[PDB]
Amino acid sequence: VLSEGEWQLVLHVWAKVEADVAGHGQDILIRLFKSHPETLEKFDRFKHLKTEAEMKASEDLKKHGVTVLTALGAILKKKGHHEAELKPLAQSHATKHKIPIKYLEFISEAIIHVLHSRHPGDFGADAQGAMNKALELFRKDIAAKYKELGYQG
Ligand code: HEM
Question: What are the Phosphoserine sites (modified residues) in this protein?
Answer without folding.
Answer: 3
